Amino acid sequence: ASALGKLQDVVNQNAQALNTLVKQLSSNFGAISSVLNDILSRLDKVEAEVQIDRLITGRLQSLQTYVTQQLIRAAEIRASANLAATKMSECVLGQSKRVDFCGKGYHLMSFPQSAPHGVVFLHVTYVPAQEKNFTTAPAICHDGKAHFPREGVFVSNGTHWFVTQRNFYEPQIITTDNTFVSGNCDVVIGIVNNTVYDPLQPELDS
């Protein structure tokens, strides 16, 4: 039952101050009694005027306390509401590129769900799992040209340098359609030897 505390806290604090605001009716505030009529019943008005001031001044102040709290507290909700309206627009209606705005992990989609005086999102996120230690290289010399991965990176399980996408392991034989050439070898730090297979070359020989 503690997952909803955020909502539960809002509802309580509202009902909280109301209780407090009510209980302020029963306080003397320096006046002879907290029942507005008793001051009128016991005392002649001339004097009862000054008494009722201490009630009014007390109570009238006690509202401004309550009102100011609500204003401040609403300004928090007003901020939280925009956070929702931001998520609802970006997360639910679109797909968010903002890391950990929609909740931990790469975000796929979100499902809004209503809750009393609140909203609850179900964020369907993509969390990778199982790792392998790979030896990697930023580039591969072929003929002395350098080949860099068009998307993703080079890795090598053993001798065969595999280009693959970053966030999931799908090894692929390295061909020029996976790599764009740039510069040449002597510059790139840590470039390694390999042979980048040609799609076209085999198609030829016939």
């Binding site: 609500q70 609403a74 992990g105 996120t125 990778p128 030896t135 890795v155 970053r166």
Partner: protein, 83 residues
């Protein structure tokens, strides 16, 4: 039992070296939890669980698997309208 702290004078919880994830915050990174029979303890708040990523200039780690997690996220929207 008495244990002096950075936050104040803490009575009734035996100290422990052995630091665990925070449970009941107190102050200055002192978190108290109930378990050991059992007695309330107090200890320096441990931050997470230590890891040292094995790292080298040729070393890359690519995930070969994935999971799809659904994480509830809860927000207030409106508050009770009173007049």
């Amino acid at each position: 039992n008495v244990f002096q702290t950075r936050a104040g004078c803490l009575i009734g919880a035996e100290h422990v070296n052995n630091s665990y994830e925070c449970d009941i915050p107190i102050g200055a990174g002192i978190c108290a939890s109930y378990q050991t029979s059992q007695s309330i303890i107090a200890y320096t708040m441990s931050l997470g669980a230590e890891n040292s990523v094995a790292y080298s200039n040729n070393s890359i780690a690519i995930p070969t698997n994935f999971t799809i997690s659904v994480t509830t996220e809860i927000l207030p929207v409106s508050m009770t309208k009173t007049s």
